[PDB]
Design a protein around this ligand. Structure first.
Ligand code: HEM
Ligand code: HEM
Ligand SMILES: Cc1cc(N)nc(COc2cc(CCN(C)C)cc(F)c2F)c1
Ligand SMILES: Cc1cc(N)nc(COc2cc(CCN(C)C)cc(F)c2F)c1
Ligand SMILES: C[C@H](O)[C@H](O)[C@H]1CNc2nc(N)[nH]c(=O)c2N1
Ligand SMILES: C[C@H](O)[C@H](O)[C@H]1CNc2nc(N)[nH]c(=O)c2N1
Ligand SMILES: [Zn+2]
Lengths: 415, 415
């Protein structure tokens, strides 16, 4: 009841008691582990008034434990107050301070997030007064501007009104506020980002005039209070982009690559005290490998290890020449170099993973544990030369949390 | 009750029913996943006559199902026969054919093993007639010779007598039949393999005269039927070694690296029909990354990314120059190149991981599933440019199996 995780590179041993507070299930049973299923049925998201008070009570008891005033009158009053409001309205509302705590701790509890050392320094924009897609677009634009901070990126989340009935639902339909378009070709090949082609067509469906290149920033599709979503173009001056050059290969400019500075995940669901915020875009800054490895080099993403290795003049005949590995390291040197030379906040997968081990030490000391998904924490290149490879991580689901949710067009009852 | 695993790079979907046959537990519960604990208490190994027949019956019912003659008289007789022998002797003995099946399927069931596409082509040397450390040493030498096959490596396992009481126990004390010695220094640094220093001293304890270099092949320490283990030097002509050169950097010879051709894991436990074979060395051929990444570049292993990157003339000031990544790809190009140019069987982590996906297809088709540990199947470099990164794997514990077991010197009641 007091589990142990070891680092096999440092012989460090931490003791995890925090998992005792754990609430939701994982997908693993005693006789099967599913630690590598991408979107388990547990990580995906309609609740009633009955279940809503335990979740409200549980969340509130830890929020007052957080600000050192647990069990007091201001606590016991706030429990009655929300109890009373959940009888009266079969839902309730979070105090501005309860939102900021809740959100911060959904990030803190994200076991698949390697950059959580910064969880406390999160900026919460309370957009619960929003009512229109235009209001969303305005809130989202001020997010983009603030979090971008001219390359000196800042963590932020903008929280649109919580789900109520379920049919009046705020959603960003984008998977990220900034993503490049994806267009299929005559021969069935793909220009742009193959991940988004389904979304790119949904935008053209609703009227997007596509410039039909690679790195075309998509418009925002914003569903407000259940109504049909509406296209909005982020002002280009607000979308900061790093053109990718290499600090050796001058032909790497002619590759003509670039990425947006701001990773800002928009399509997920924030759970606080049993309340569901269906739109809650959040942003940080990139780890280099998300762009250099996954975006640029996944097979069904930009798939550039081909053209890069060509220009490197690499033994591409044999699989065992490791030409794919060689061209991958250069591509990530270029991403990190490019972002740093434009003063745009980026972190390499070595620095990010050491900070996470430093963060894990804090969380097992001043909190008793740190839920961690090794399958997701280990960078997708040079796994074992980074210190997270050798660290055992206990994965469990705490709340407040971020949950996946179905894409809106699979569920949205249209006009 | 018919779980689904998806490949997110190919959209391939397999259906796992084989996990229904699963028997032992994993360490994960509904509310915690431990898929990244190295040696869970389940994966580590005294049984009574009561429990011994279900395990005997379960194993035999699948062995006759294997050779198409399930439920027949030869089956029902063999069940009575072993039932009778487990009453009479509170243990039993495997037919030569039941050993070969059992062993092959312990390899087949090893969910952490990426090279299992070859599980059926395993050579089983039945050393259950062995009684002395000298007999062990002779059996082990014929293993080494056979599996090495002059660089054209072959899979093999040598099975010493099964555990009985528990105090008469055959054990190879080596973790592998061939490993380099590790000696600590005046300044506390380490010459050789830091992993083995504890073992290297136990050998010098029992009388090993150490040549005190790096790549000094350790002697065998062989415990036979419970008696004190005894040192034996594998004839050097039997220990094939690849000196590591690079196909560009002529200063990579002057690095002076070399590795043994034969990976041969000796310290683990083979479970067949509830029977425990405490000594069962098994060997295949290397994946390149086990040497180039883990051996050569783990921090507490040979830790050569230092000296290699120096000679590469690399930006070692900044962590974010990715100099560690750059020097790692070259080191693995050199290992693969070196082994191939000496006609010594080696596989690159790209070829090995594609074969495993091909193998996974066979196992979900002609068997209903394939237990797989993603944390261990994904190569420790260039994770996501290999197809196992994107494949969901169901991990479960089938039997016959290989289990870890405590090291003998922590348990051996000495003389
Ligand atoms: C501050 C810089 C940040 C960095 C470097 C970072 C890095 C990462 C990385 C590399 C992943 C793995 C996902 C992938 O590779 O596709 C991830 C996942 C995630 N991060 Fe962070 N992130 C940051 C900020 C944030 C913020 C501000 C939040 C929430 C407000 C957050 C919450 C999450 C969540 C929910 C996931 C996915 C967990 C899941 O899929 O279940 N992160 N992050
Ligand atoms: C034929 C070539 C083979 C290759 C390329 C191969 C490769 C690997 C690799 C890369 C690992 C991960 C361990 C690590 O990286 O430290 C592993 C684990 C393992 N392999 Fe294989 N192997 C081969 C043959 C065999 C054979 C012949 C057996 C059994 C007779 C076997 C059974 C296992 C077991 C039991 C494990 C570890 C599972 C655990 O720790 O629970 N493998 N193998
Ligand atoms: C704020 C932030 C910063 C950063 N540097 N990186 C990220 C990446 O975050 C996520 C990535 C995915 C991709 C999931 N895949 C199946 C497509 C799903 C999520 F839910 C995430 F939160 C986020
Ligand atoms: C036959 C074979 C071929 C091959 N190419 N590689 C291997 C590696 O197999 C193992 C490696 C370890 C290291 C475990 N670590 C904690 C030190 C533990 C085991 F039980 C293994 F079976 C085996
Ligand atoms: C199949 C597997 O779950 C899937 O590829 C996961 C593995 N680990 C990951 N880890 C991170 N950080 N990001 C990912 O997208 C994935 N994908
Ligand atoms: C902590 C973690 O379980 C440990 O480092 C594991 C991770 N995955 C691995 N995978 C392989 N193939 N070999 C290993 O030694 C390990 N080590
Ligand atoms: Zn699990």
């Amino acid at each position: 009841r007091f589990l142990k995780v070891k680092n096999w590179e440092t012989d460090v041993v931490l003791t995890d008691t925090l998992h005792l507070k754990s609430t939701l299930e994982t997908g693993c049973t005693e006789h099967i582990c599913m630690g590598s299923i991408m979107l388990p049925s547990q990580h995906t998201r309609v609740a009633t008034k009955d279940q809503l008070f335990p979740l409200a009570k549980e969340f509130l008891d830890q929020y007052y434990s957080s600000i050192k005033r647990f069990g007091s009158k201001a606590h016991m009053d706030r429990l009655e107050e929300v109890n009373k409001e959940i009888e009266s309205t079969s839902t309730y509302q979070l105090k501005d301070t309860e939102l900021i705590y809740g959100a911060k701790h959904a990030w803190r509890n994200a076991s698949r997030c390697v950059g959580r050392i910064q969880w406390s320094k999160l900026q919460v924009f309370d957009a619960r007064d929003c009512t229109t897609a235009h209001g969303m677009f305005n809130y989202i634009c001020n997010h983009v501007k603030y979090a971008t901070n001219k390359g000196n990126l800042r963590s932020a989340i903008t929280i649109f009104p919580q789900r109520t009935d379920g049919k009046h639902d705020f959603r960003v339909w984008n998977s990220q506020l900034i993503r490049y378009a994806g267009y299929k070709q005559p021969d069935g090949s793909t220009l742009g980002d193959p991940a988004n082609v389904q979304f790119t067509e949904i935008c053209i469906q609703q009227g997007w005039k596509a410039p039909r290149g690679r790195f075309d920033v998509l418009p925002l599709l914003l569903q407000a209070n259940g109504n049909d979503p509406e296209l909005f173009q982020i002002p280009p001056e607000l979308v900061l982009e790093v053109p990718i050059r290499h600090p050796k290969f001058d032909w790497f400019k002619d590759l003509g690559l670039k990425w947006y500075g701001l990773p800002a995940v928009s399509n997920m669901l924030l759970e606080i005290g049993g309340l569901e915020f269906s739109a809650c875009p959040f942003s940080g800054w990139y780890m280099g490998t998300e762009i250099g490895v996954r975006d640029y080099c996944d097979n069904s993403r930009y798939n550039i290890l081909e053209e890069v290795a060509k220009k490197m003049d690499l033994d591409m005949r044999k699989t065992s020449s490791l030409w794919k590995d060689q061209a991958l390291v250069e591509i990530n040197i270029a991403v990190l170099y490019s972002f740093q030379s434009d003063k745009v906040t980026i972190v390499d997968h070595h620095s990010a993973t050491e900070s996470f081990i430093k963060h894990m030490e804090n969380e097992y000391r001043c909190r008793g544990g740190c839920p961690a998904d090794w399958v997701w924490i280990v960078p997708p290149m040079s796994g074992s030369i980074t210190p997270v490879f050798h660290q055992e991580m206990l994965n469990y689901r705490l709340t407040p949390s971020f949950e996946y949710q179905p894409d809106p067009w699979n569920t949205h009852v249209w006009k």
